[PDB]
Design an enzyme around this catalytic site. Structure first.
Site, PDB file in Angstrom:
ATOM      1  N   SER A  19     -61.010 -79.569 -28.965  1.00 41.84           N
ATOM      2  CA  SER A  19     -60.393 -79.305 -27.701  1.00 41.84           C
ATOM      3  C   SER A  19     -58.912 -79.548 -27.696  1.00 41.84           C
ATOM      4  O   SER A  19     -58.432 -80.293 -26.840  1.00 41.84           O
ATOM      5  CB  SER A  19     -61.107 -80.137 -26.690  1.00 41.84           C
ATOM      6  OG  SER A  19     -62.373 -79.573 -26.386  1.00 41.84           O
TER       7      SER A  19
ATOM      8  N   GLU B 246     -70.886 -75.945 -35.915  1.00 37.41           N
ATOM      9  CA  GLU B 246     -71.684 -74.760 -35.594  1.00 37.41           C
ATOM     10  C   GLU B 246     -72.511 -74.171 -36.758  1.00 37.41           C
ATOM     11  O   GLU B 246     -73.509 -73.484 -36.539  1.00 37.41           O
ATOM     12  CB  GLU B 246     -70.728 -73.697 -35.016  1.00 37.41           C
ATOM     13  CG  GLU B 246     -70.259 -74.284 -33.706  1.00 37.41           C
ATOM     14  CD  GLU B 246     -69.026 -73.759 -32.974  1.00 37.41           C
ATOM     15  OE1 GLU B 246     -68.564 -72.664 -33.293  1.00 37.41           O
ATOM     16  OE2 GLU B 246     -68.535 -74.459 -32.076  1.00 37.41           O
TER      17      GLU B 246
ATOM     18  N   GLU C 110     -62.876 -82.292 -37.042  1.00 37.47           N
ATOM     19  CA  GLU C 110     -63.316 -81.881 -35.699  1.00 37.47           C
ATOM     20  C   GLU C 110     -64.527 -82.789 -35.368  1.00 37.47           C
ATOM     21  O   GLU C 110     -65.662 -82.627 -35.827  1.00 37.47           O
ATOM     22  CB  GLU C 110     -63.747 -80.381 -35.620  1.00 37.47           C
ATOM     23  CG  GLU C 110     -64.418 -79.837 -36.925  1.00 37.47           C
ATOM     24  CD  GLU C 110     -65.914 -79.448 -37.013  1.00 37.47           C
ATOM     25  OE1 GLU C 110     -66.231 -78.335 -36.565  1.00 37.47           O
ATOM     26  OE2 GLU C 110     -66.730 -80.212 -37.571  1.00 37.47           O
TER      27      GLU C 110
ATOM     28  N   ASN D 288     -59.285 -70.577 -35.303  1.00 37.92           N
ATOM     29  CA  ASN D 288     -60.650 -70.104 -35.538  1.00 37.92           C
ATOM     30  C   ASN D 288     -61.121 -69.357 -34.274  1.00 37.92           C
ATOM     31  O   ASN D 288     -61.310 -69.975 -33.225  1.00 37.92           O
ATOM     32  CB  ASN D 288     -61.529 -71.280 -35.785  1.00 37.92           C
ATOM     33  CG  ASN D 288     -63.026 -71.058 -35.823  1.00 37.92           C
ATOM     34  OD1 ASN D 288     -63.574 -69.999 -35.605  1.00 37.92           O
ATOM     35  ND2 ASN D 288     -63.766 -72.103 -36.110  1.00 37.92           N
ATOM     36  N   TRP D 289     -61.313 -68.012 -34.347  1.00 40.24           N
ATOM     37  CA  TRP D 289     -61.707 -67.169 -33.213  1.00 40.24           C
ATOM     38  C   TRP D 289     -63.143 -67.277 -32.742  1.00 40.24           C
ATOM     39  O   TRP D 289     -63.501 -66.815 -31.656  1.00 40.24           O
ATOM     40  CB  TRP D 289     -61.470 -65.724 -33.533  1.00 40.24           C
ATOM     41  CG  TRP D 289     -60.010 -65.287 -33.561  1.00 40.24           C
ATOM     42  CD1 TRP D 289     -58.952 -66.159 -33.662  1.00 40.24           C
ATOM     43  CD2 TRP D 289     -59.599 -63.972 -33.487  1.00 40.24           C
ATOM     44  NE1 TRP D 289     -57.884 -65.409 -33.645  1.00 40.24           N
ATOM     45  CE2 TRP D 289     -58.210 -64.094 -33.550  1.00 40.24           C
ATOM     46  CE3 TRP D 289     -60.199 -62.719 -33.375  1.00 40.24           C
ATOM     47  CZ2 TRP D 289     -57.407 -62.939 -33.502  1.00 40.24           C
ATOM     48  CZ3 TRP D 289     -59.404 -61.580 -33.324  1.00 40.24           C
ATOM     49  CH2 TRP D 289     -58.016 -61.687 -33.387  1.00 40.24           C
ATOM     50  N   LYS D 290     -63.965 -67.944 -33.548  1.00 41.52           N
ATOM     51  CA  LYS D 290     -65.406 -68.011 -33.405  1.00 41.52           C
ATOM     52  C   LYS D 290     -66.033 -66.625 -33.299  1.00 41.52           C
ATOM     53  O   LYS D 290     -65.625 -65.761 -34.079  1.00 41.52           O
ATOM     54  CB  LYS D 290     -65.712 -68.910 -32.224  1.00 41.52           C
ATOM     55  CG  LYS D 290     -65.562 -70.316 -32.789  1.00 41.52           C
ATOM     56  CD  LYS D 290     -65.542 -71.395 -31.695  1.00 41.52           C
ATOM     57  CE  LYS D 290     -65.440 -72.750 -32.385  1.00 41.52           C
ATOM     58  NZ  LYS D 290     -65.773 -73.879 -31.541  1.00 41.52           N
TER      59      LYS D 290
ATOM     60  N   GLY E 124     -59.529 -73.813 -31.695  1.00 37.17           N
ATOM     61  CA  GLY E 124     -60.716 -73.081 -31.334  1.00 37.17           C
ATOM     62  C   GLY E 124     -60.335 -72.138 -30.229  1.00 37.17           C
ATOM     63  O   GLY E 124     -59.447 -71.305 -30.414  1.00 37.17           O
ATOM     64  N   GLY E 125     -60.870 -72.350 -29.028  1.00 38.28           N
ATOM     65  CA  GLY E 125     -60.728 -71.470 -27.868  1.00 38.28           C
ATOM     66  C   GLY E 125     -59.308 -71.073 -27.489  1.00 38.28           C
ATOM     67  O   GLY E 125     -59.120 -69.977 -26.937  1.00 38.28           O
TER      68      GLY E 125
ATOM     69  N   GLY F  56     -65.145 -77.655 -27.826  1.00 39.75           N
ATOM     70  CA  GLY F  56     -65.422 -76.946 -26.603  1.00 39.75           C
ATOM     71  C   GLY F  56     -65.611 -77.833 -25.396  1.00 39.75           C
ATOM     72  O   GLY F  56     -65.776 -77.304 -24.294  1.00 39.75           O
TER      73      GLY F  56
ATOM     74  N   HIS G  63     -68.231 -75.951 -40.734  1.00 34.52           N
ATOM     75  CA  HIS G  63     -67.912 -76.160 -39.335  1.00 34.52           C
ATOM     76  C   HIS G  63     -69.155 -76.708 -38.611  1.00 34.52           C
ATOM     77  O   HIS G  63     -70.218 -76.259 -39.070  1.00 34.52           O
ATOM     78  CB  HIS G  63     -67.466 -74.822 -38.831  1.00 34.52           C
ATOM     79  CG  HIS G  63     -67.064 -74.844 -37.389  1.00 34.52           C
ATOM     80  ND1 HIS G  63     -67.828 -74.975 -36.315  1.00 34.52           N
ATOM     81  CD2 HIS G  63     -65.776 -74.687 -36.970  1.00 34.52           C
ATOM     82  CE1 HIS G  63     -67.040 -74.898 -35.264  1.00 34.52           C
ATOM     83  NE2 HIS G  63     -65.822 -74.726 -35.663  1.00 34.52           N
TER      84      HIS G  63
END
Lengths: 254, 254
Positions: free
Chosen positions: B212, B97, B167, B9-11, B233-234, B173, B95
């Site tokens: 994470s 967010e 998640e 997931n690139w956000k 994620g990141g 994050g 999600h």
């Protein structure tokens, strides 16, 4: 005086095929058109494709929303910085469909206007009153409120280079548009209302009329003095969009 | 038993250049990986761009949200027929967010799941609890809740071909990941919970871990029995995503 803009908001309608067809036809159909400025807003996943297909012509690309964040941990959002990257200029914000269906507020639409400006993108700020508000006599009051969320917070320099799009809710998709007389009464009110704060900015802000514009009525409407173009919904998807652009162009070169 | 899925997931990250770079290097760097299924979720106005660049490889595409309508008078909406047309299979929904920042609700996230499924897309339903919910011991109640939104309305069947991505919110994050013991215990709970309705469906539902995750903890986490993959994620934006993929692949082929 002001250079007219006809912008087509395609709404939830697009496909790889439809984008290939409409935009390549428009591109040949709108060759040497110089009196009007044209933009289309394809559904987001098609902005890039229509951007490549519109090359060679002067069709401007637009988008139907932005969110408030430029980057980071925001799943599912729309960055203005990315809209910019992909080639959109005209971002519709505050359309009735986001305001009702998506419960979007004046305060939020203003912070979005704020972002777009800051980035260098033209907001097409939608305003409009509903039939209830219309009968009640509240049209001046609704419109004015709605402009003021940007005007009273950010100031009249915010409108330097923006587009207001008056879209009488009772007119969107209904088939009942405002008469030229109605249309122009509100576009003059809007303009007067910005001019109270700065008349130099009022004179330049493009006030498009949206809400059941099609080829038949495109010219009666455009004859008005404070109608600067149109925001086209349904007919964007129809070849009749060219006829609407021809109304704004040749009447421009009176 | 279950073939792994690692979805990045690139956000809200992306541009024409990063999309060129990441996908071409991924495409080249994933040549021959069959032990894992890989999917990426670029931001929406780049799914086409990435789909094209990923052609040749077996990098599935995805998207970070849908809305409830397929076509129409809905400015700024994402349609499932349209995501499907541009080439996306994995659509992330629910999600944290969107759940916090966009106040997205379970009844809504469930209606979006229905919509994806009926179109033949694979929903990646995020679930999770917050730190507070964790401390109080509510992990069970929270997660079951969120799963039951689809399970009690739509049945166990809704899960055939669907992905669940646990998640823990305190993990996103933060750098603070669930231990393999936490991860596994919850993933086993979810699977136990679906199974009590239909066992046969619970053996085929992929339950991914997100929160994470990175190259160093992908291995330790994949060793658990009920952890069928990773929602990254990141590190999706880092070359370390391929190292994560090699950890699901090599250990799958045990």
């Amino acid at each position: 005086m002001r250079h007219p803009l006809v912008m087509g908001n395609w709404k939830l309608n697009g496909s790889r095929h439809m984008v290939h067809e409409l935009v390549s036809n428009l591109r040949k159909e709108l060759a040497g058109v110089a009196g009007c400025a044209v933009a289309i807003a394809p559904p987001e996943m098609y902005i890039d494709m229509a951007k490549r297909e519109a090359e060679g012509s002067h069709i401007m690309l637009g988008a139907q929303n932005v969110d408030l964040n430029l980057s980071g941990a925001f799943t599912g959002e729309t960055s203005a910085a990315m809209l910019k990257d992909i080639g959109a200029q005209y971002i519709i914000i505050g359309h009735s469909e986001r305001r009702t269906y998506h419960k979007e507020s004046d305060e939020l639409i203003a912070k979005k206007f704020a972002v777009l400006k800051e980035q260098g993108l033209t907001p097409v700020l939608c305003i409009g009153e509903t039939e209830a508000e219309n009968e009640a006599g509240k049209t001046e009051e609704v419109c004015a409120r709605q402009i003021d969320a940007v005007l009273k917070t950010q100031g009249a320099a915010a409108f330097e280079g923006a587009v207001i799009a008056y879209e009488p809710v009772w007119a969107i998709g209904t088939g009942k548009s405002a008469t030229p007389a109605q249309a122009q009464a509100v576009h003059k009110f809007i303009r007067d209302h910005i001019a109270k704060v700065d008349a130099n900015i009022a004179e330049q802000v493009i006030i498009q009329y949206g809400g059941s514009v099609n080829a038949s009525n495109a010219a009666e409407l455009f004859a008005q003095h404070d109608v600067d173009g149109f925001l086209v919904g349904g007919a964007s998807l129809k070849p009749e969009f060219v006829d609407i652009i021809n109304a704004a162009e040749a009447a421009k070169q009176a």
